[PDB]
Amino acid sequence: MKIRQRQRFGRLELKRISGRGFKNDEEILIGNGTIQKIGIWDGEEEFHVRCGECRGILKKSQMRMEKLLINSAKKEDMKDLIILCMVFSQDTRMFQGVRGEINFLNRAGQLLSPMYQLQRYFLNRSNDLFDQWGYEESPKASELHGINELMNASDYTLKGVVVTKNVDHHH
């Protein structure tokens, strides 16, 4: 239907544009050697995504971020959107990136649930994530360019992530 409330994953705002995922509770052995109970989504899905000023298209499958296209925006929003999408995608690389205990409390003194532990952890320790994520030679394409961990156009890109330029197509 035309009017749809957006879904939210902390700071990440999302709207699904294709696919049909199904959620199954699974036990996941993550990178710090602990087992986490997580509702894992299965199926190829694409989302419209946004964090602050940065907007993009996220394509995922089960525990895999396939492709992330985003616009150029303020670097903190670009970086946060990428991290939130890596976490949202439940990518195995993301799970494997965790070190030490994820036992963060909220302001009501309760433990965050596992997905929110992960969002909180990687937002504030992104080098853990990006190291595990992998880098590849940037795509050489006309309207797309890769980005590095500093959110700059580079010869090498975070794997699966692509940025568009702000171009005056209509003059």
Ligand SMILES: CN1CN([C@@H]2O[C@H](COP(=O)(O)OP(=O)(O)OP(=O)(O)O)[C@@H](O)[C@H]2O)c2nc(N)[nH]c(=O)c21
């Ligand atoms: C990883 N997610 C998370 N998610 C949805 O994104 C929102 C934020 O996830 P969440 O806060 O972990 O949801 P949760 O607390 O598990 O509640 P729910 O029972 O709705 O899943 C929720 O609306 C959740 O349903 C998703 N929706 C789809 N279609 N595919 C997905 O892979 C995912």
